[PDB]
Structures are given as structure tokens and as C-alpha cells.
Amino acid sequence: EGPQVKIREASKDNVDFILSNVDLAMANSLRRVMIAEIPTLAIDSVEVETNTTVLADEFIAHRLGLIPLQSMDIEQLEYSRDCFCEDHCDKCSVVLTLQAFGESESTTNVYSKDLVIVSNLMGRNIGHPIIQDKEGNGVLICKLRKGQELKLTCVAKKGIAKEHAKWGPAAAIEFEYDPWNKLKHTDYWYEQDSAKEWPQSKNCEYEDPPNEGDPFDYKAQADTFYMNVESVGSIPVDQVVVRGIDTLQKKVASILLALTQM
Amino acid sequence: ASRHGQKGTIGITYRREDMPFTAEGIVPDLIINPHAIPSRMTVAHLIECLLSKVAALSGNEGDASPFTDITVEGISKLLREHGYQSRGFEVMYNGHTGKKLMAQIFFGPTYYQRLRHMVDDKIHARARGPMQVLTRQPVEGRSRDGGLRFGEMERDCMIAHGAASFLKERLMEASDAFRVHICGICGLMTVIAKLN
Amino acid sequence: MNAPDRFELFLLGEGESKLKIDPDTKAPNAVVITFEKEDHTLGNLIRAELLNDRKVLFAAYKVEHPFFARFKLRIQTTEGYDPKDALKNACNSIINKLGALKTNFETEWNLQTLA
Amino acid sequence: MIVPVRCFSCGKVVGDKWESYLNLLQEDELDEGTALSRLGLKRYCCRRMILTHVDLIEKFLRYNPL
Amino acid sequence: YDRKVPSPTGEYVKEPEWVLETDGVNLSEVMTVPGIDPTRIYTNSFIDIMEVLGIEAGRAALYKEVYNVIASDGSYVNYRHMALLVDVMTTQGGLTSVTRHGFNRSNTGALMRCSFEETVEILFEAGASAELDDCRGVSENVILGQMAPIGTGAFDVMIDEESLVKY
């Protein structure tokens, strides 16, 4: 019914596909939104009780923000600034706790398996650290030996990646179009051969070669946009793409809405 | 700075979106300029960009080294077999529009290093403050709130410019300044201070 | 510090509407529209969409300075015809084009299983 | 100084990955290029992140606490 | 040495000649040598020329070097810049040095002189032999921090009476 899509292969963390009947600008704008303007959740203010670890109070505080948390029910949660509470709360904040003591004489490793949510869940899949380790203890924090202590109270708040890269649930967007380069948007630098020196792309298989002899297309326009989207875990790989379209028309819905207002 | 003597300074920061990307979706950790290398003649840099990419892709820590029988043609062969373009150049897309960039940016993980010279500890601005104990002119050093010394040659400029009145006030109230009473007969600091 | 806040990039300030409509005095039937709290992300897909209309005589966006997230947008159209409606239609058409991909892919993911 | 969480260029999580990588070259006894091929480290920016990293934390730990 | 010279037809044409350059400085007797042009014959050292020919032929040979010294690296400076300084060293009488001795012992003002190099040396020779200061020197107005007779304070503005009543 207009712009068409075909999934090449789809995994638990990655989705490869093709895009037909699409504008190049809208294609590049799609990745831009998926990168930054995607609403997530992560730590914003790490409160400290005791720290004896060889890492600076702020080294740790930084680390945490980067630890992924389940953001499946992101929209239900409200932005802290948009909230009515005197700073923080359940409807906008997910309090966590990281209590630790190097009892084991060994190199006492700390992971996501060590942090506990101390706020009300509100019966929603949100604020859960993402574990992707075989032994079931994802994302390493720090290490302690003997009398070394660390007790925290890290607090999660909404936010998009345009504020800080930690709310970036797009691990990297693989973007490609016209691998045969019929449209001729790039001038291939070569000392001997153009084709031999320049690597042939995976996306050549899914497109028609130039066959040669025929003069370059005068009425040229870009199409067939090959894309692989990688999630970090904060949100499922399917939601990543769809929410990217959702927020984009939302960021546009705002413009006309305002146009009417004026 | 790179391990070559290419003393770089930041002059704006963009995040992932605006920044250009390879087909794999790789944005550079920073952007240099093609204008450094010919005036500096920094060749070892271009191979340090190169050799580091192969060293990262192969996993086996690639030997940079000084006097070793290793050539770029030897490096390129191992990079060509690694799938990537042997010359180093990668087809990049404009982070803004998506439209392919006519020129293919040299992409490689050159070992960079942060320097102990930061702007926040370099900056200063004084609009009247503590004056020298003997000379009554602004003090020295940003710390003790010390004013910028308008050098001998700076004066030479306000003279050449024909700014007889700029430097007339710049040497006075706009900096040092002074009011005295002298004898008409002797022309010395000899009149007894009373006024009232 | 001197550097600004990261939220200032997307949030809206003290008395600055997401759009400011003014009339370009240089050329007739032309307008200049500033986008506070906004970047290429929109302007680019707005440039591409406005071009596709036949009544559009001119369409160009300009990121003033990469310091401040505000781009001006100049639109000029046919004599008599208002440029706001040219923006209004395209703005809606983009959502119609977007909404199509939101659903096409939604069913396409159900169809696709699994790894 | 602990395995740097998420790559700086792309942005893929690198916390859990240490314990696996550090053993892989020992429990299985193989090269880095094979370990980095596995672990899902596709693009080179993610690949370097661990390989080029130095886990000094380990040396700081052997200093008696206080 | 190739030399552009006018053909009888009117046009200027490349007419080369034989010029013999040396590594010695004696003009007083090489000029007296027959079979050589004692007009075109220029010595590197202008200091000889000034003594051999005369101060105006001296200023002439002073520029030639001053010019070529800048013209060397293919650098250009508008005549008047070099033709000022060159004239500066000659407009005294003989040759003036552009160092402590040459110009800092000149007719110039005491406070305008103690600015360059010799500071307490020029302050003692001025007070003992009793001398006045024009208060026209740049360094003088600078020291005093008063309206210098430079561009902006060269002339002097006064109130007009004609257009005061008029408006």
C-alpha cells in the first residue's frame, strides 16, 4: 500500500531488511530519530553512603548510567521534568540499590545481578537491568578485595540520547543504497582498477547490475534502502524500529498542531 | 595529539546523528582535516591509521615498529583479504542528508592522546581589580586576577593606526591613571598635599 | 564551564514557539519560518516533501549555526496560494507515508519468526 | 581500569564480555581474532574496545585496603 | 648577463652582455681601470659608494640591497616603506646605524631615546649637559600619557561660533 518492507533475517538483538518506494531524506531521518530521539530509562543521580573501592565516586556514577535497563513500558513512565512530584517519584523514577562487601578473599566481581530496584513496579516491564551473560550476571561494575565496601542508591529517570548517549538504544544502524552505484553519487578513487580495488557489497545480490554500454540514468532517483538495526537490550529489536516511526510522526504531529495554534 | 606532533584542539562537537557513517554504521571518534599531513609531511601517521585497523580486525597485535621490513603493500594485502578496501578509504554517507559523499574518508584507529592544556585553566578576563603594590598598575597572573599586558608592539600598533586618543585613555583610566600637583617654577613633585 | 546544557537542545525555552512565521520582503509570495528546538532530522524530510508538490516555486532549509538547534526554512509558492497550506498538506502526507511503514513492518515482523 | 561499558563509536555494551574473553583465550586456548569474531564484536570499534583495553584495576586491588 | 635593451626599430629586446663579478672591495682604483663602464659598476657594499660617489648615490645603493633582501624570498614591499628607512639613515648627513650608537645619539629627545636600548646611559648625558624635550616625540606623550600629536591628536578641535547661533 505504498512503501514496502522485507526482512532478510531477524535475531534477538538485530534486524536486517530492505526498503522500497521511500525518499532518501526520510530514510536518513529515520536513523537519526532511532539514534537520539528514542525515549529510554537510565540512572541520573547516584547517591553514596560508603565507598572504599579503588574507583573514584564519580567513575562508578558514570559506569551505571551506561548499564542498560528494561524500557519496554517507557511511555507509561513520565519524564521527571513533566512530573508533578517534588523531584522524582515512582511515576517518573525507578530507585535502585547496589550494596556490596568483599567477603570473598577473591577478586569480588560486581554485575547487574547485584543491583536491586527499591521502588514500586506498577506492574510494568520497566527498570530491569539487561543480563546477556551465559552464567546469568550481565554488565560488570567494579571489583573489591577484603574490607573494601560500596553501598549506593542510583536513581533512574526518562530522557532521550540527544541529552546523553546512555539513552541510545541503537547500538549502530547499518545503512546502504545503490551498491552497483548506477546513480553515481560517489567518485571511486582508483590507481589501477575501479571494480577490483573497491569491495563488492552483500546488497549487490539483491539489485540489478549496470550491464554497461547504456549511458548513465538522466532521470535518476534513489531507492532500495538496505538496513540492519542493532538494539543494546533496553528495548526489544522490533520496538526499536516501530518506535522510531512513532516518535518521528509525533515530532511532526507537534508542528501542524502548533501551526493551528498560531 | 597523535603520536606524531599533530597538536589538535576541539572547535565544536557533534554527536552520532550529525556525524558521517560508513555502510556498517561506523561514526568516527573525532574528525581531523586533510590539511595537516602535507605541511607537517606526517607520513608515519597515515600508516598508524592503517596498520591499527588491520591489528584490530585480525586480533593479532600488528607490529608498527621503526626499522622492520614491512610495507603498505604488505599491509594492504592483509586488509584486502579482510574484506575492507586495501587503500584504507571507506565510502561514507553524510550524517545530515544520507546522500553519499563523493570522496571516501580515510578511516583508521590512530592512537590519540590527551594533553595537560585545557581551556578552562587557560581562560581569563579582568574589568578593574587588584593593582601592583609599587607601580599601581594591574597585577600579573590569572589566579591573583592579573590583567593582560598590552605589550610594547601593541602600543606601536595604536600609534601606526593613528589612534592618538585610544592609547591616550588606554594608558590612563582604562588601566593605571594618576592625578598630581606640581610647582610652575620647578616642575617637580614638590607641592604639599592638603587640598581641603 | 561556559558550555550550555544538553536538555536545551530538545526542550523549549522561556517564550519561544516551535515555529515563527515571518514574511520574506525580498521576494513576493515568500515566507521565512524559524524552528526553535529542532534540527536536520525534520528540516531535511521537510525539504524532500515540499519539493514533491507542483505549486511550490521554492523550498530551502538552513541550519543557522550548529551551536544553537534552530534552522530557518524559506518557502515560496504560486500567486494567490498560501505557503502554510503547502506545509500543512506535506506535513500530513508525511505522517500518512510514515503510518504506512509503521503497519507494513508491524505485520511483516509477525510473519517473520525466529532466531 | 575495568572493561569500558559500551563502545565509544558505535555503542554496544561491553561489561559482561570481559570474563568470557579473558577465559576464552585460556580455557579454550586460542587467538584474540577468534574471540573477537565470537562475542558478536562485528565492527572494529567494538572489537578494539576490549583487546586494546588494560585492566589495571587488578594491580590496584593487591594494594592492602587502607 | 641577459639585458632587455631597445632594438633600433623601437622595441625592447633581450641583448645579453659579459659582466664580471668578484669577491673583493676596492672601487677607488677599479673605476680608474680602462675598458670597463665606470657608471654601471656597482659594489655590493653601499658604505664604499657613499664615500666614493656621494650621499644621494649612497641612499640609492642602500635601497638596492634593502629591496633585494626582501625581494629574495619573493616578498614584495611598496617602495615608500624601504625608501623611507633608507632615506632615514641618510637625511642626517652621513650614514646612521639602526642600533644603540647610530640613531640613539641623534638630535632626538631625551625621553624618546631612553626608550630604546641605552636607558640610564641616555638619562645621565641629558641631565648633566642640560637639555630640553620637545614633548612632540611619541615615547614622550606615551610616558606622560597625554593627547599625542598622532593621527587623532595631530590637529586640534575648537568650538565654532557661526553655526552655533545658526542652529
Next chain:
Amino acid sequence: FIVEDDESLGHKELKVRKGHIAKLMATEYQDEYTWSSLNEGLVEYIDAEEEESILIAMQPEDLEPAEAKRIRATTFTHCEIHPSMILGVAASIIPFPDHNQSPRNTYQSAMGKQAMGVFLTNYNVRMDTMANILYYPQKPLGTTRAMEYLKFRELPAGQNAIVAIACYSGY
């Protein structure tokens, strides 16, 4: 190294052989056969003066028998270990200094004193007037052999970051 004219099975070769290597490697494996064991007369200490009357072989491979890549008397007294050993501290940390212009490396042999990273490990316990550390330091991707001895792979100066030789606006 010391080079000698006699070789019954060959022609000429330095007093150091393939047996002495394994002999040295054994000490390095356990942590007897040392540099003090090279008292043997396989290496000599060449003074600033003693150098006036001598003949050193550069690469023992390039300078030994009868008869693309970079441009290539037979009365040798001594031999060179490696031409990398001609450079000081910070100069060793420079990759392919041979491939680079000489003053460029001279400007770089100063930047090393401005570098961040880790200068020690104790620092936390060691109270100091002004100290700089790196959040996540990284050893170089490109390595120059000498670094292994200078402990640069253990205590770095920066990170390996993706450099884009670009013209992305005018900043």
C-alpha cells in the same frame, strides 16, 4: 655484538649462535644465563672514543653472505643489535619514526611530557600536588617493540580513537 673472521663451515659470523638463545630463554621462562653471562665475550661496551676505530654491521642479515620493498667493506669487527636502540625514551613511543619527517618526531618528543594516562599505580595512596589520570586508558593498536620494555603497554598515554580525515563543515 662481537664479529669474527673465522668460520670453518661458512665464512664469517658474530660470536652469538642459536644455542645461546634457548640458553637465555630458559632464565626468562623460570625467573642463571644472563647479560653478565655475555663475561663470555659475545658483546662489548663501545666507548665514545673506541667508536673512532671500529666497523659495525647494521642488519646482520643484510650484512653477511655472498651475491618490491625499501632500498638496501667486509672487514667487520662488531655488529648492531637494532637501529631502534639509537633513539631515547619518548622517541621509541613514536611509530615508524623512519617513515616520518625528522622535526615532526622532534615536536612529538615533547608531547609525551604533556600526555595524560597513568604515570604510576600507587597514586591513590601517594599524595601529590598535581596529578592526571585517564578514565579508561588503552595500550596502542600499533606497537613498536621497545614499548614492551618501557612498560607503555602496561601504563599508556591515550586511547585508540577512529580518526576521520574529513571536510565535515568548516570547524
Next chain:
Amino acid sequence: TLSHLRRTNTPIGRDGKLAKPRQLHNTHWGLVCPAETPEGQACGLVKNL
């Protein structure tokens, strides 16, 4: 930290007439670094071993 240790400062006067000393002498081969030197002031006077 190492670079401050393997270093050599030189004085002035007495000698140093129509001589170098700064310019990298042939005899500096292997013993002294050909590139380690501090620009301007004491350039070629302070060498790194």
C-alpha cells in the same frame, strides 16, 4: 616519568666559541637520541640518553 631520568643538561661559557654545540654531531650515534631536544632556549644543549 622515564624521559626525565635518562636526560643530560649542559652548561655554557669558557669554550663554545666557533663550534656547534647544539647541531647533532656524528659521535652522538646510538648514545644520545637524535630527536629528543627542547625547542628554542636550550635546544640541542639538553639531550636525552
Next chain:
Amino acid sequence: NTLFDDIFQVSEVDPGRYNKVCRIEAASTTQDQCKLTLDINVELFPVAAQDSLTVTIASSLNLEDTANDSSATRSWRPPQAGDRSLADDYDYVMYGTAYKFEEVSKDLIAVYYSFGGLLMRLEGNYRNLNNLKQENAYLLIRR
């Protein structure tokens, strides 16, 4: 109104360090005395030696006006979608502006044009008083 009508035969196709464009030399059928230097793109339009290409110059297009101190018509309007037709029938087609009116030999003349970046030279006569001044003029090519 028209200001030229002729056909030219391809003599030389010269890139000269270039790629997207080619320097072209041709000779007229109506007069052997007359010649041309044509600068022309290839990517979209390919060129081959010895070919009959119906060439034309002309000024502003249409039948009415004929226009009253514009001069354009003022600025520029896009090709719409299928509305309004000028001399669209012709193949390649360009727009440029003249500058030099070189006096060759007695009757012979050479008029220099600039198509933004591209250039044009031509010889012979029969053009005279109706050829140029106003200097702004188009270019047309058929089959």
C-alpha cells in the same frame, strides 16, 4: 522568436583530463566555410563522430508578448508536471550568455558564449544583424 537554424557534423570528441563533459568540434552542411566548437556533456547524452544534429539558438520562447523589459521572464518557474510547452521537442538543449564578437576575416565572424561553465565558438556569416545583442540566448539540439 528564433535566432539560428542549422545542422552540424561531429568531427572531434575531446575529454581533456575531464570525465562528465567533452570538447566538441563540428562543420556545417549549408556552408563549408562555417565551423563550430561545441562543449557538451556525455553521461546522459552520448556523442559519436559524423552525426546529423539539428542545431538552433533562439531567445525567449512562445508566440505572444513578444514581453516588455523583463528580462527573463524575470526569474524561473519549474517544468510544472506537464503544463506549458516551449520548444521541448528538441533533444539536449541548454541556456547561456554571449560575451565576445571577434572580427575574423572581412565577412567572417566568431561569437563567444558561456553556458555557466561551458563555452561556444562559431564561424562563417549569414547571421549578421539578427544574431545577438541582447547577448543572453539559449541553445537547441534535435536528433
Next chain:
Amino acid sequence: RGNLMGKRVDFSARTVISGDPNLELDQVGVPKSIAKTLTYPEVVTPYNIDRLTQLVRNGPNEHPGAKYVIRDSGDRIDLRYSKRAGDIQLQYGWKVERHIMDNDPVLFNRQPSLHKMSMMAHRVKVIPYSTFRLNLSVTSPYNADFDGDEMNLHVPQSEETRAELSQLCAVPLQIVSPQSNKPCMGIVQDTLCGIRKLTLRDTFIELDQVLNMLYWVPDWDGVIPTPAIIKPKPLWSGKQILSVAIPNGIHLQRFDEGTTLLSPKDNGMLIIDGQIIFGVVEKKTVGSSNGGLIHVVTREKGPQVCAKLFGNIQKVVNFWLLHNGFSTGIGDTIADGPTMREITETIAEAKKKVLDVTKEAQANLLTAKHGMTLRESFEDNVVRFLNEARDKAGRLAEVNLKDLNNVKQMVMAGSKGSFINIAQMSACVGQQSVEGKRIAFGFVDRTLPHFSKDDYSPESKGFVENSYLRGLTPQEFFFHAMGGREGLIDTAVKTAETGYIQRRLVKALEDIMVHYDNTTRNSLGNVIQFIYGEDGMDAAHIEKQSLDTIGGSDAAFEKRYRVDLLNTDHTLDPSLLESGSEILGDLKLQVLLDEEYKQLVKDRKFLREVFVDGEANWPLPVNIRRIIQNAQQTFHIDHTKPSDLTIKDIVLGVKDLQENLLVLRGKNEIIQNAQRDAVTLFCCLLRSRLATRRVLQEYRLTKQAFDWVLSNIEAQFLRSVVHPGEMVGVLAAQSIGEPATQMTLNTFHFAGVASKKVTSGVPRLKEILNVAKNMKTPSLTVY
């Protein structure tokens, strides 16, 4: 030295400078604090109160504010504290220490400022992030690379001190350097590296991208042009779209290298009425050059017009370039496979060449040159072969490399790159030498112990056969490491030496100024000159003009200048003039055409005494080879129609004008004689240009067009006169300090004239200024 001539000052600021394309030529990016940390005083005037009270109530922290409020008395109300810090009565005649604002004239100093420039008046633009933003094109007068480079300041206090910056020190005022009479600034870096790729024929910009390029010009009228084609896709020529930035009402002509009025290599430059006709843009076209667009733009249009163009070009060019892109790699400096065999065979003939000559030196059969010793003569021959090799081996890769190579493109535009930069990097380094001489034997008879005694071979004497691409060998390394150090060793002293010179000059200079009678005097009244620089002209107004008279054969001067009304073949076709036949065969009107030719030929012979070198091109005021080209564009003169004036009008008109071209007014003969002596050359040029025949044969001048030219040339010349009060001698001090700062940092190779070559730059300049009787260069030329 440190309290009177240069002292610590208030209302000054220092922080790291940053490049910016979106900043104006005459702009400064003062940090959001700094302009908050600095205060300008304003009187409570009715034209500011509302803005001022708002700013006072805005206080000393909310960006635009005020720290102190001064009363009618000696009271200074400090709002940082105070009780009524928010109130403030605000009464007339009161002072306000207000925080600096956008477009606020301010003094900008890049230490060390030598010349008049490097000390401009940048109008403030307050921005975030802790760095002093500055324009890219304004890196030429300061000579500052943004590599952590930090810059000084001084904010003016009175309205009068501010008026001095605004009206005398403003950045476009200093756009032309009176030093070399040519521009101070031009297009650089990306804006130079890009524009070449943009201005050509192989470049087509598609409509979508085009529409924005038009909006990016803030001066753009709104007039969309017509694509340089039609075809199935409407494309645009990079030049055509750049011609937008070039203000309409300007015509440029170059003709360089090839140039055939239709060049295929896009040589030279032609711009007419702010539109590109044909050619490519290089350092010669845009960048600071003695006619390179900007020079024409300022002079013809204006300084503000030019300052606006500088920004226009930057923003537009950079826009296409951010979207087109650019890079350089290892491949960009790689020589071809067959070229690698041919580049190595270049050294094959050279290593033979040296040996064949070495074998001559060993067998005593060497000729040994004049003055030079056998040893000296030999070394000079061996040094020639080494250069001959590398300087050609450099051309061996240069010509071999394709145009798509960005390394070649970087050099082809200018910006950052030279032929020697490619040569050493790609082909070969060459021989490194200390004190001119090759690597001497430090050890007895040997350079290194790794080499044998008496090895005079280039390999052992310091030659580096290898390229930087190939890498160096230990020997090659230490050898370049020796010669490379020497470079620094001397250059450091070279830069410390130029310092003492600059002061010596400027000190001895100071008091020297143009007085109110064109008399260049000083503090005393000691006359240096009677007319400034022998003409009494301001050095910025002067331009390199060709005097037509002096050149050509005597036949061509007669064929172009002799007007004989009485002749049939030596008269004017009445298609040129109106009264052509009614004035023909005239005897009373021919009087003047002979008298004109008397004064016109008189010049050619006098000039030939002056410029004995037969050179016609000289720097002179009023660009007449333009005022005449201006009429043909403005008045659209025919082409077909005859001249609306007569011969009596030309000959007298030209004569009557000369009278009005005054410099000195003084009644007495001597001063009037001096005024004639001052104009002398200008008239020689004027008469060469306004010859009664020329005016009609090629020029085509009407009455309207000619009378306009006479009035234009008069005001332009009277505008060109020097400004009495000009510190002329403190000036022409640094307008010699600045050229001397660089130069010697490149000087080296070639003997024979070994004395003059070594005693060049600064070494011989100490000798000159100091004026000491020491040889170094005794050498006299014998004619």
C-alpha cells in the same frame, strides 16, 4: 620598558581561539561569560533607559546585565551585592557598568602584533563553550593556527575611544595591506580546497541541493536563475551558482598560462558584472593577491561589500563541501608500479654520474673550477647531480599521478601544499646538509662507524634515496636527523633575531609622520621627505598598472597613437566620430593632434630613462584600465554607433583634468613645481590611456561616458592622496618587520653566488641596519 611603553591593562581578556565559517569576517566569538566578566559604561540617555533598566534589573549574572551603577556623585552602586540591586531608581546623567553585547566594537590582539594589522576592531557576538571564536579567512593578518592558540584583548571605555576602533581600526578597513599594496586576507583551508572542485565544468549541482545554496547567501535577492542546461534533469554549473556570491556590478580579467579566450584547461579568469564567464578558482583567483578578486571587490565596490563577500563565499562553498566531502590516504601518496621502476632508474644514472666524476677526482684528472679549490669544485659537481635527480624524480611522480588524487587537488587549489611536499613524501627525500656543506666526517674520515674511511659516496655522505612512504634506513634516518636538527637550531635563532630588528626599526621610526603640508617630518621637524613616498599617496590606493607608452616597436606606437586628420590612411573613419568628415583635412584642429603627440611621444623617451629595464607594469594610483571598462558595462556603448563628442573635447578634456589632480595647494613656484614632479608619472599613464585615437578605435566613448570617466578619475585620485597625521614612519617599520619574520625559514641551496646566497635574509640584514664595515659579501659587479 615594562611600565610605560607596554603595561598591564584593565578591560582585557585571553582564551583559546577557534575557527568558524558561520562567523563574520569582522566578528569575535566572545565567551558567554567574558562579555559578562567585562563592563562598558553608558550614560542614562533617553535612547537606552528601557534597555538599560531592564539590563540593571537583569543584574550581573543573567547574561546581558550590569555590575555597577554610578550616581551623580562619586558613588558606585555594586549590584553583585547591594540592597536595592533589583530596584534601582534610574536617574538621568547616571553611569552604568554594562555587560558587553553583540556588535560592540572591541580591540583584538594576537600576540605578537608587529604590523598595523593583528590589532583589528571585531564587533562582538556572545556565544557558549569556553573559547574565543574567530573567522577562518581572518587567520592571514594574525598568522595564527587554531592549535590551542590563545588570544589577548582590550574593550574600549569611552564612546570616543570606541569611535576610534569603529571608524579607523575596523577589520574591513585593514582588508588591504599598504605593505605590498595588495589584500591582507583571502579565502583559505576548506574554503580554498573546496572552491576549486566547485568551480569547473565536470561539476553539476542538482536542483534539490541548489535551492539551499541560494538561501545560504544572506544578501540573495530571491531571484532564482536558469539552469545551465535543460535536458532530462536540470543541472547547475558550480561557477554559475557561485556567481551568486559575487556582487553584480563587477568585471574581472586575468589570462594566465595557456588562456585562449576559450581555454580547455579552464586557465585564467573572466568575471563580468558579478558573473563567472570562464575559468577555475585558485589561490590566484580568490586568495590575497595583487588583483585576486578581493582586491578588485574592495577598491571598486566597498570594504563592507567585501567583508560581506568574505562571509558569503565561506558559507556557500563550505555548504557544498560538507555535502560533497573530502579526504586523503596512504593511497593518495602511492606511486604507480611502472613509475616505481622508472623512479628508481632516475637514481641509476645519478649514482653512475657521481661515480664517473669521483673516479676523475681520484685519478687527478679533474679540471678544478675558477676561484674554487679542486675539493670545492668536486663537491659542487656532486651536489648538482643529487638535486638534478630528486627535483626531476619529483616531477616523475607528480605528472604521473591522476587528477582524482585528492593530494594533487590539495596542492592544485593552494591552501596547504607545494611541489616539494609531494616530492619528499611520495618520491625521494634527497641530500640533507648542515651549513650548506654535506654530512662531514665527524669520526676521522668517516661519517658513521657503520661506514668505511673516505666514503665520499652520496649514500655515506648524507643522501636519502628513499621516500617517506618507503621509510628510512638507520643511516638515512640519522643523516636527515642531523640536517633536520640544524633546521630547528637556526630557525629558533632566526625567529629570535628578527625580534631585535623589528624594535630597532620601529624605535628609530616612531615620531615619523605626514604633517599638514605633505611634508614627512618627525618630533624635531627634520624633513625626511617633502612629499610622502615621492608622491604623497596612501599606500592602499596604489595598484600595479602597465604604462602602454614605453612598450612595443616605434611602428606599433605610431600605428596605435598617431592621429593625422590631413592624411587619408592615417585619419579616423567617420564611423568612429560624429563630425569625422566635417573635422577631416582640418589644419587648426590638427595643431592639437600634433601637440598631443608631442607630449605623448615626449613621455616614451623620458620613461625609457626612468624604467631602463623596459618594464611597463608598475604600482600606481587610480585603476584606469578599469574606469574605462566600467563605462562599456554601465553605459552599454556601441559596437556600431559613432562617438557623441569631437577631437576638441578629448584633447582639451584630458588636458583640463591634469590641472585639477592636485596634491599641494601652495601658491609659490617651488611647491607648484613639486606638485608637477609628483603627478609626472600618473599623467604619463593617463595620456597613454586617454590618447585621442585609442578613446575611439577600441574604447568606444560617448560624451556621457567620457565626462563621467574624467569626474571618476579625479575623485578617485583625490581620494588616493595620503591622510596627513598617518604615522607613516612607525608604519613602514613593521611594513618591513612582517616581511622579515618569515623568509629566512626557507633559505638554503645553490653556490657560486655563495656569498650573496648565505648573506641573504636576516644574516645580511644585521649587517645592513647596524651598518658595520665587515666583509661577508665584498663582491663587486663589473660592467
Next chain:
RNA sequence: UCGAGAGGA
């Protein structure tokens, strides 16, 4: 404060 050393571009 004062006088010595290390860097900045």
C-alpha cells in the same frame, strides 16, 4: 615578595 628552573605557541 624576590631570584633561580620546567613548559605553552
